[PDB]
Design a protein around this ligand. Structure first.
Ligand SMILES: CCCCCCCCCCCCCCCC(=O)O
Length: 131
């Protein structure tokens, strides 16, 4: 369902979310203008995500329900899993530093991939368009 190449289109509440994550002024400004492009490839229960942005070009591989580690562009480490719940991909992660939970949702909406993030009562969204 998620295969393809998606480029960020719009953001809602994103700088606010980053602030709450405690990310510094500069990195927040840069983060908000990262030109994030995701190429997603699903092969059974295995997904490979090519994360391409102004920060880095990283390949992320994970299997549904198997815990993995991921580091954010500013170096903060998370551990968690992605699971399929019906048509959405639900990501439940914990910050390695303070043990607080980060929930991420990926859902498609005809031509658009919406990624919604929640942390400590703050919700933000990133919207991507199919290439
Ligand atoms: C400079 C820091 C940027 C701020 C980043 C905001 C938080 C993004 C959280 C993404 C968590 C899930 C990503 C896991 C990898 C994947 O499945 O694509």
């Amino acid at each position: 369902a998620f295969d393809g190449t998606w480029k960020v289109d719009r953001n809602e509440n994103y700088e606010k979310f980053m602030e709450k994550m405690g990310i510094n002024v500069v990195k927040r400004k840069l983060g908000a203008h990262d030109n994030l492009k995701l190429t997603i490839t699903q092969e059974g229960n295995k997904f490979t995500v090519k994360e391409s942005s102004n920060f880095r070009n990283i390949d992320v591989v994970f299997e549904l329900g198997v815990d993995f580690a991921y580091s954010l562009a500013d170096g903060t480490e998370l551990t968690g899993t992605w699971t399929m719940e019906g048509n959405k991909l639900v990501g439940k992660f914990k910050r390695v530093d303070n043990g607080k939970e980060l929930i991420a949702v990926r859902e498609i909406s005809g031509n658009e991939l919406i990624q919604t993030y929640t942390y400590e009562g703050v919700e933000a969204k990133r919207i991507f368009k199919k290439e």
